[PDB]
Paper text:
The C-terminal 31 amino acid of Inka1 (255–285) was able to induce crystals more efficiently than the Inka1 (166–203) when they are expressed as haemagglutinin (HA)-tagged proteins, although the iBox38 has a higher affinity in vitro. To confirm that these crystals indeed contain a 1:1 ratio of both components, we generated a single-chain Flag–iBox–PAK4cat construct as illustrated in Fig. 2c. To tackle the in-cellulo crystal structure of iBox–PAK4cat, intact monkey COS-7 cells that contained large single needle crystals (<5 μm in cross-section by 50–100 μm) were trypsinized to yield rounded cells in which large crystals could be easily observed (arrows). The X-ray structure of these in-cellulo crystals provided us with a number of important insights: under cellular conditions, PAK4cat adopts a typical ‘closed' active kinase conformation that includes ATP bound to two magnesium ions. As we expected, the activation (A) loop Ser474 is phosphorylated and the central region of the iBox is packed against the kinase through both main-chain and side-chain interactions. In the in-cellulo crystals one set of crystal contacts is formed by the interaction between neighbouring N-lobes that involves the two helices from one N-lobe interacting with the β-sheet of the adjacent N-lobe, an interaction area of 768 Å2. The second set of contacts lies at the threefold axis mediated by the PAK4cat C-lobes involving primarily hydrophobic residues; each C-lobe contributes 576 Å2 to this crystal contact. Remarkably, the iBox is not involved in crystal contacts and is exposed to the large 80-Å-diameter central solvent channels that run the length of the crystals.
PAK4 is a kinase with strong links to cellular transformation and cancer metastasis, as reviewed. We have shown that Cdc42 directly regulates PAK4 activity in mammalian cells through an auto-inhibitory domain (AID) that binds in a manner similar to pseudosubstrates. The recombinant 38 amino acid ‘Inka box' (GST-iBox) is a potent of PAK4cat inhibitor in vitro but does not affect PAK1, suggesting Inka1 is a specific group II PAK30 inhibitor.
Numbering used by the authors: 175 to 197, 297 to 589
């Protein structure tokens, strides 16, 4: 893989291929039949015009499209059954977004099976991803606080039912045109419960991976919180720590070193500094819960939606 500056997730888990990294007919038909039962029946192509590809992903492509009867725009994510890194994770794309209506979760309208593709029709977030903004601009604390608040509200809800997102980074936060903020990328979730306390699968984007996850130890909803820390580093410093190193070299460093600090603490409020110390804590048991964090003084800094508007490409 290694070049560095790589944004693309990495998906394995709980086996030998996952150790290696310390330095079909029957199954398909069964899996397809199962999905078929889980999704909404029908074919969206019967009600949707104008499919144009607008985005590429680890698990598939995204197109915009037109509700024929209404003119309304929708986004459609299309995922191949044969082209998945861990086929079973596709259940997430259907189940999660459905089970979690919330002001900070992207809305899902419907899901269908089309050929050997899973298709999810979801609301179109006209604002774009956070990543764009972070890589081409400097958010002030008011705007940063507004972002974390939204993300944290969503995470509190997922973690309440022991759902781990496993892919928290700017590429996963989307925006409406009027400065509202939604979490978006539920492809790689896992769940914990009273009888499955932790998980051991190696899933995430290298630079954003919690260090206990890298150390192949059993993890929990805590990993998301470390990743959020890293996302804060993006919003401030523009890219994650060790971004320029190759993913594998970066991980090694994350496992071994002390939690990363911001480049320049001269201009950052102690309120924000203190916040981030609650996120990037190596020992998970010490690291803060989204529940707790929602009460942190820093988030009272959070500006309204209107204060996010100027950050978006249309207005730069
Ligand atoms: N509802 C939406 N509105 C606008 N843009 C979207 C929407 N959904 C996705 N996109 C854009 O298209 C891309 C689609 O990839 P997405 O992040 O949805 O999942 P993925 O990388 O395929 O897999 P995973 O969900 O497992 O991380 C994103 O990078 C995002 O910028
Ligand atoms: Mg994504």
């Amino acid at each position: 893989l290694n070049r560095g500056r790589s944004r693309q997730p990495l998906v394995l888990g709980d086996n030998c291929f996952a150790d290696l990294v310390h330095n079909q007919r029957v199954s398909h038909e069964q899996f397809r039949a199962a999905l078929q039962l889980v999704v909404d029946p029908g074919d969206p192509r019967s009600y949707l015009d104008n499919f144009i590809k607008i985005g590429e992903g680890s698990t598939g492509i995204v197109c915009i499209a037109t509700v024929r009867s209404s003119g309304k725009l929708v986004a459609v994510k299309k995922m191949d059954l044969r082209k998945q890194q861990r086929r079973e994770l596709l259940f997430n794309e259907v189940v999660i977004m459905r089970d979690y209506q919330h002001e900070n979760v992207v809305e899902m309208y419907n899901s269908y099976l089309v050929g050997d593709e899973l298709w999810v029709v979801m609301e179109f977030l006209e604002g774009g991803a956070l990543t764009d903004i972070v890589t081409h601009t400097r958010m002030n604390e008011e705007q940063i606080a507004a972002v974390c608040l939204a993300v944290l509200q969503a995470l509190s809800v997922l973690h309440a039912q022991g759902v781990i997102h496993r892919d928290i980074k700017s590429d996963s936060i989307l925006l409406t045109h009027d400065g509202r903020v939604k979490l978006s990328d539920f492809g790689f979730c896992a769940q914990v419960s009273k009888e499955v306390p932790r998980r051991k699968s190696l899933v995430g984007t290298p630079y954003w991976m919690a260090p206990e996850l890298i150390s192949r130890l059993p993890y929990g909803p805590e990993v998301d919180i470390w990743s959020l820390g890293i996302m804060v580093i993006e919003m401030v410093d523009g890219e994650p720590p060790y971004f320029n190193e190759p993913p594998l070299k970066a991980m090694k460093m994350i496992r071994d070193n002390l939690p990363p600090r911001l480049k320049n603490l001269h201009k950052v409020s102690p309120s924000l500094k203190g916040f981030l110390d609650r996120l990037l804590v190596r020992d998970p048991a010490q690291r803060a819960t989204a529940a707790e964090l929602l009460k942190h003084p820093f988030l009272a800094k959070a500006g309204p939606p209107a204060s996010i508007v100027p950050l978006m490409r249309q207005n730069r």
